[model samples]
Target: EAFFIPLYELFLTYGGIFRLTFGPKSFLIVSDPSIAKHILKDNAKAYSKGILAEILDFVMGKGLIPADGEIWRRRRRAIVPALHQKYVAAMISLFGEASDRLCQKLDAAALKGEEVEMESLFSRLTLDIIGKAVFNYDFDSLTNDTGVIEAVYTVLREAEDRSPRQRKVATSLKLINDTLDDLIATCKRMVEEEELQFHEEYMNERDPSILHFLLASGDDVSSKQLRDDLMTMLIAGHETSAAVLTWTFYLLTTEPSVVAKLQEEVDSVIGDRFPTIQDMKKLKYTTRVMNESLRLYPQPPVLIRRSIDNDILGEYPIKRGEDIFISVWNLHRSPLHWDDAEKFNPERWPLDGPNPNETNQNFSYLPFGGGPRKCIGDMFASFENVVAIAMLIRRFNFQIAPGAPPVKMTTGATIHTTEGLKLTVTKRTKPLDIPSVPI
Candidate 1:
């Protein structure tokens, strides 16, 4: 019955590594640390993305997330430098600005005693951040409904519906592609006309926007490649961070003591002022809260890959072209790896603790994934999340809506609430009085 088992529950019955056959296809569901390390790091060259990448490619094209081998190498090289710490640090102002807008919107809702759908709100906030920070575009998603946001959601929704008929999925895919086509064309035109302005204002800065760097790279990158890269970042960049923040607040509302500690940290380190990148280092507990949230609700609950050649995973023999499911959700919660694994205790992450990848030899905690293919935006996401969470919590008090359903999870490109995360917001009576520090 392992074939019929829920993916999260599989580890209970089968331990870490279990194989299931569906007709001619075989899948190895892995929650074991050694096997995970072997597959994701040690023998990473022998594996590549599996069916999930194929599904994403329908919309992503040759984007970094779905591209392989030399294509991936070239695209990654061109893009990675732009996401370096220096550049991401420069994006702190954008993060603070977007987060300020979110607080203002929520403050309005609080004045009306309105219930806020947090998932959608966070999504808009993140979308707006990625827009301004990554490409110098303004989505205005916080105040206005945009076709681009709708199209992106449609693509994500359709991608998650594995049972959808072929034609319906294709139609949905086309909607996203068309949307990207228009966006990419407009961006290219802007790049051409404003090349001088961009160079003067952005290219020479400590942190250039990803789009600015790409335009200046002089790499002769094709239009399709540019479109693919932008769309990939659009979806991967915003969606995952949005979901993480949503879940972070959801967990906070349920854990009052945790909320108290988080508030105390923010009040002391970033009282009444916008959190900057420099403040992030002092917001230690706040950082752990984000990390704990990620552990419990990893953006993508599973990591999918395919073996490129026959290899051994622990004692099990893996065949070429076999599919592997690394159950990040299961591994993160496994009792064998974590003490009080089911609890949400931020203290588990010590101030001077060794990094999980170094200390957790079994590859147990993989919030941003592991090895070479680990998320390129891990630093960006972490910094953005910490800043957003700190700013919002300092400004508002969030409570689960009266009569709202308990949080439930659904799988997609990322794990999000099956029902939207609904919360009641009220402006803080005594907002922190911290002064803003220079970036």
Candidate 2:
């Protein structure tokens, strides 16, 4: 049976939060706000991302996600500055260009009267976006045919589906290590080629990109570690954003009034211009839709942490080295924190203090897990999601295909539709004045 089948029933019966032990593991599944805060914030120092971290470490080596203690802090500090808000702002043009190309691709697919494999398309777009914005290299996923990127995705897909027990096997270890080796070699060659070009011709200035920044970090970050960090960004950063957008679109198709409201807000706010950071402030409705999607289907479905030291949670005693599962999927829908918890309601996230009376009750609403180790790329993800969704709705009217069943959730590291989301999108007469493809 699917994990979702049992998990869904558990959620519905027990108010979206319950615990089921896995062998010796005593997982504390939290769906209430106070409990979430206790795990992620209040007692964070006593905890660290556990098995998931080890799995990623095995595959990608050491970076922010897998590291713990002083090592983790140092790496996070070094890398965090690189993705700061000001730095992220400078990449908006790159993001816009990537979005333009994606829209063009989708437009072509719509014209063919073929099903747009949006999950695959988004995977490509985000991969390209991260490549250009961070490294100045092109994955060519947006438009060109590339075997290397395809191979990398294939390896990652396999990794995502691996079971807890299988993850420890020698074969799984060899497959992941071999794939990483190929990808690292490719990136190193590309970076070296760019450097040689710069040395041979100083007259030519290289673009300021994340690869350049990492190289210039002055830290004695080893080649292996650097490769791992790059791999981490390549895999970790983009997939979740893609999942959120795909799921958000799935919801909007089911709720036309919400789509109209979104269209109205986009028109009123953006009018004839593309959005900048300043303009994004006014895109409240779009922001809400993204938030609701995140609440329902947090991309990396669950957060796991192991106790760094013994701790107590109310009546529960958590021992050192014990794994703790923080199920954001369930926490966001907890009846204790939300009214009509299962429904898609964007109004739940209000900007002002005194939020919905129901949710005001402790840590139940954590779309981005709270505290020191909270996601560093949360803002980036939100910006990308809002822009992509707003752009799509402005140009097309979407509906679930007549014969298609409503999306069924599946978990593969990230939460996704078991079958790909199939929807029909018709071009609106007056398309939003989004930029055309690069010449």
Candidate 3:
């Protein structure tokens, strides 16, 4: 069963905050927005990644998400400055070009009038994009079978599902470590060979990956810390964006009105042109559609933390070393905080108004988390998703395929459709458009 579903029933039964004790360990589930603010924002330092750190330790090592205390502080300081606006601007073109390739693939499928497995296609797109973005490697998973993908899935399966000590799992885990090492060697060579200007928001157009930025910053390019950072970002950025795209398309298929509005915004802002950084703001309805999708189907569906110092969450005192589940799923769907809470309405957030987030919403909405330690790549992932969604929606006509497997939600690191989103293909001629189609 889904992990967060029971938490929902418990939240309604015992109010916002409830304690579920098992053996010697007690897990505190926080559903109230105000209490969530206390733990995640106002008094944020009193928490850690908790048990999440332990399981992820093998794969991430001292990666940012699992790293706590001083190393996290040091890494954050080193990393955050690298993603300046100019780099993000450069990434816009990268996102467009990658998404353009996706459209081309769909074009072929539409020509043959074949059914498309959108879930797998979306996953391949993210893997390809992330491979290039993170370390300047081309997985090319979309076009052909390549890269350390076999290793990636195994590690994600082994790591996120649970710790694996079996001989078989350990063997593949080594393969990933080996693959990353080879990746680093190539990056180091690229870093040293390119003798270019390293200025404010410096971007090497030839190889504009995040590793380029970090290695160019003159840190020990060979350190394990750098490898861990690459691993974490690869897992974090790649997986979440794919899940978001899958859900966005799935949600849009259910609401034709939303599809109409979304297509209108994309056509007006993007037209036949590749979406650029300038076009992002103009695609207000496009952004809101993506935003509202995230509201309903948050990637992880839950935020896990452990208390570091004894602190009061709202009125109740939390003890040090206890586990906490900030149920973003509960808060987002709770009628107490929103009207028609479960409805997927983009207009609920005005285009003229501020972007939806924890600050303005008072910790109620956490798409990329909140507080000082919120995701460093929040804006990066947001634009990437928006760009892909805008590009796809502007072109295709999608519907849930007849006799396709039912889409059911299941949680791992992110919410995934159990049966995959299989849909029909065709070419779009006009508004209520259709082509290189997917549902």
Candidate 4:
């Protein structure tokens, strides 16, 4: 809270770009759109991962997030195909089944009139999705605990701590690494034993999951690289998707009209059915709502980078060793680009009106970072979010739980609620023909 309070105050005071000095080090806090584009896109080669990447390197190693230059390029090439449109399209069944399980769990809670902590639920759902889609493993986070969730959160919490007197936890990063190694060994054994089935396309050469694909690629990728890549996907894929959904639900509860329109769109297109990839395209308004939520509360509110060499950002001078903070939080809500910037309005998205490109051509609204090193799993996240949101809106109505504390924000691995988001769920009264698929 202390960290963000000053950051926000400074943004308000300085408007867009400001310089803060700490001893011999100078840090540039930038919220300007054109400058953001200049750094992230035009001259991206001049910069590398900053302190944020260093902090994460303890856990992530040379994974895509922290890897720079040639290493990043190679790992990216190997991992990109697994998340291509075809592979993601194939994972729809897994997504739907997971959503069905979530609805069932929530349905039970709704019947008992219990308050649901949405953050945990969404986290579990995404965990299950990524486990199956990326690692070819079942976390079964909704039903059972394999200690993966515990380990994941431990790393995130530890990474977030800046104070010297940080509390020690039972779980260690070594234990988590060991668990991942064991998981990889288990998957390798399964492939060796011919016990696991691959798709027809994957049988000869091209496999789907990141693990299988990387293994199949060749002997060049090391076991360490494989572990790092999996850990990267597990953390990156799990947290951001969950955080986005949580914020989307929080926004939905406050805006009745928005919810009504969202429900209408879902009802018209989906109509008490699990949303398929085909159905997802038709739910434009629902997509808009997710986009709007992302605009307001991006998962990682800041993007950090360091200058590899001295360069000018517009007229401003830069030094080789200085750190750069791209304030995505400020840029997304900048008054110069957005009208009533503080307001939550889905209609502002390109599908409705106010073309995003016209307002700030360099990228004023970057929920996903721009240019070469942008979040690799962006399309995958969108697909997961749209499916989850569509399925939930079709089945139930959510409202803030009575007498719960007002929702507050905090930053961890991602921007999340300080207190859990408490919501009372009510099953839709006018039930239509709900579709059922075998799990």
In candidate 2, which residue ranges exceed 4 Å CA deviation?
A: 1-5, 8-19, 22-26, 163-206, 351-362, 430-439
Clashes in model 4: which pairs?
A: none
Q: Which runs of model 1 end up more than 4 angstroms from their true locations?
A: 1-5, 163-207, 352-362, 430-439
Ranking by lDDT: 3, 1, 4, 2
Query: Which number leads on TM-score?
Result: 3
Clash pairs, candidate 3, are: 426-435, 427-434, 427-435, 428-434, 428-435
Give residue 265's error in model 2 in angstroms: 1.4
Best by lDDT: 3
The ten-residue window of minimal lDDT in model 1 covers 198-207
Winner on lDDT between 1 and 2 is: 1
Q: Tens-digit lDDT track for model 2 on 1-120?
A: 235445545766764335678786556555555656777888789888888775676556676777788878887776766665655666665666677677777677677776676777
The per-model lDDT (C-alpha) reads 0.79, 0.67, 0.83, 0.78
Model 1 lDDT per residue over 230-255, tens place: 87887788889999999899989878
What TM-score does candidate 2 reach? 0.84
Evaluate residue 287 in candidate 1 and report its C-alpha lDDT on the 0 to 100 scale: 87
RMSD of each: 3.5, 5.4, 3.2, 3.5
Which tens-of-lDDT digit does each residue in 187-213 have in candidate 4? Answer: 566567554444323432223566775
For model 3, how does the per-residue alpha-carbon lDDT over 192-306 read when each residue is reduced to its tens digit?
8987877767877887788888877886534678888988988888878899999999989989999998887776777656777888788788889888988998977988899
| Model 2: residue 45 alpha-carbon error in angstroms | 1.7
